[PDB]
From a paper:
PBP6b (also known as DacD) is another putative DD-CPase in E. coli, with 47% sequence identity to both PBP5 and PBP6a. PBP5, PBP6a, and PBP6b are periplasmic proteins binding to the cytoplasmic membrane by a C-terminal amphiphilic α-helix, which is important for the physiological function of PBP5 (33). Adjacent to the membrane anchor, there is an elongated, β-sheet-rich domain, which appears to position the globular, catalytic domain at a fixed distance from the membrane. Taken together, our data indicate that PBP6b is a DD-CPase specialized for growth at acidic pH and that the redundancy of DD-CPases ensures that sufficient activity is available under various pH conditions.
The construct that yielded crystals suitable for structure determination (PBP6bΔC) lacked the N-terminal 21 residues of the signal peptide and the C-terminal 14-residue membrane anchor. The structure of PBP6bΔC comprises two domains; the CPase domain is formed of residues Glu2 to Thr262, whereas the C-terminal domain comprises Thr263 to Thr346, with two breaks in the modeled polypeptide chain, between residues Lys272 and Asp287 and between residues Leu317 and Pro320, because of disorder. The crystals contain two PBP6bΔC copies per asymmetric unit, which can be superimposed with the root mean square deviation (RMSD) of 0.3 Å on 324 aligned Cα atoms. There is no significant difference in the relative dispositions of the two domains in the two molecules in the asymmetric unit, therefore, the two chains can be considered to be essentially identical. Given the 48% sequence identity between the PBP6b and PBP5, it is unsurprising that the structures of PBP6bΔC and various PBP5ΔC constructs superimpose well. A global superimposition of 292 Cαs yields an RMSD value of 1.4 Å, indicating that the relative dispositions of the two domains in each PBP are the same. Despite cocrystallization of PBP6bΔC with 2 mM diacetyl-l-Lys-d-Ala-d-Ala, there is no evidence of bound product from the pseudosubstrate. The crystal packing involves the region immediately surrounding the PBP6bΔC active site (Ser42) such that the observed crystal packing would likely have been disfavored had the product of the CPase reaction been bound. Of all the residues within 10 Å of the Ser42 side chain hydroxyl, all but one are invariant between PBP6bΔC (Asn39) and PBP5 (Asp49). Asn39 in PBP6bΔC is 9 Å away from the nucleophilic Ser42, and, should the CPase reaction proceed using a Grotthuss-like proton relay mechanism similar to that of the GH45 cellulase, residues His214 and Ser216 are likely intermediates between Ser42 and Asn39.
Author numbering: -14 to -12, 2 to 272, 290 to 309, 323 to 346
């Protein structure tokens, strides 16, 4: 399924980073969070939004992943100082490439060239694509978020928040199914060059992480967006401003592990003896044995209890 405060929530672990959000997928509920709204430069994480515009372009049928795109000199790292040092798909002017293979270059390689080529194809140009990136931050209520460039390079004005990126990540996971799946592909070969997905957590042999993206912000630490499944439930950990690359891996998997062991996401409501609503909730596992629920329409209300404390309330029907 996809949709204030968690009752009797155990104490959060201490988190060594600037900012953090651990969020539930089904509900969007924050399980824990520190300094989550502080404006911080996202660096390459801007590319989550870039992929999202591509996803939404496919979803509205304006493009298709089979569409054959021609690479302008725009999307070629030779002669563009904007690109040197940065990560690339290594496209050449005159290359004819699928939307799909450009989406893989974006995601798996974090290809800055690929962003430009997708941008020109999708909006007709770089600045119109950023207009769309800002329109989709505004639709999604990313109140701390503003973009300037299609790849996050040469963009000192751009900014986001741990919270906003949690929200954007949930929208990404909830979009086109085969788009999100490309975040889990471990490698891409393009024009004779093979490169590795930079998200180390994908190879973790203790979870099912199909996560998003890692990054770094000149003089503001190390950042991460992971997401993990366990059975029928998904968590999203954003970490920002960790000391070191090893920190953000350990802090992100410390968050997700504490999420996984101590909480569950459950179906409270459905169709029966008590609603018209289906309703899902994030609860501590220790709280599951303590939850109690005390013409066409009707006139009472349902009052959900955890132990002897009411938490939420909805009308009573039939």
């Amino acid at each position: 399924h996809h949709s204030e405060n968690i009752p009797f929530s155990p104490q959060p672990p201490e988190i060594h980073a600037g900012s953090w959000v651990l969020m539930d997928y089904t509900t969007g509920q924050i399980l824990t969070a520190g300094n989550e709204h502080q404006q911080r430069n996202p660096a390459s994480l801007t590319k989550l939004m870039t992929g999202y515009v591509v996803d939404r372009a496919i979803d509205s049928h304006r493009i298709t992943p089979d569409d054959i795109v021609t690479v302008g000199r725009d999307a070629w790292a030779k002669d563009n100082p904007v690109f040197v040092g940065s990560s690339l798909m290594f496209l050449k002017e005159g290359d004819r490439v699928s939307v799909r293979d450009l989406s893989r270059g974006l995601i798996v390689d974090s290809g800055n060239d690929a962003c430009v080529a997708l941008a020109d194809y999708i909006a007709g140009g770089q600045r119109q694509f950023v207009e769309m990136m800002n329109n989709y931050a505004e639709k999604l209520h990313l109140k701390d978020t503003h973009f300037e460039t299609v790849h996050g390079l040469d963009a000192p004005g751009q900014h986001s928040s741990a919270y906003d990126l949690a929200v954007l990540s949930r929208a990404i996971i909830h979009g086109e199914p085969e788009f999100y799946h490309m975040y889990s592909e471990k490698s891409l070969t393009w024009n004779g060059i093979t490169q590795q997905n930079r998200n180390g957590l994908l190879w973790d042999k203790t979870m099912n992480v199909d996560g998003l993206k890692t990054g770094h912000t000149s003089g503001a630490g190390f950042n991460l967006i992971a997401s993990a499944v366990d059975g029928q439930r998904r968590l999203i950990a954003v970490v920002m401003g960790a000391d070191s690359a090893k920190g953000r891996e350990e802090e992100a998997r410390k968050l997700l592990r504490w999420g996984q062991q101590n909480f569950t996401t459950v179906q409270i409501l459905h169709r029966g003896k008590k609603t018209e609503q289906e309703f899902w909730m994030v609860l501590p596992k220790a709280e599951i044995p303590h939850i109690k629920a005390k013409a066409h329409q009707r006139v009472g209300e349902i009052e959900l209890y955890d132990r002897d404390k009411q938490v939420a309330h909805w009308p009573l029907v039939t």
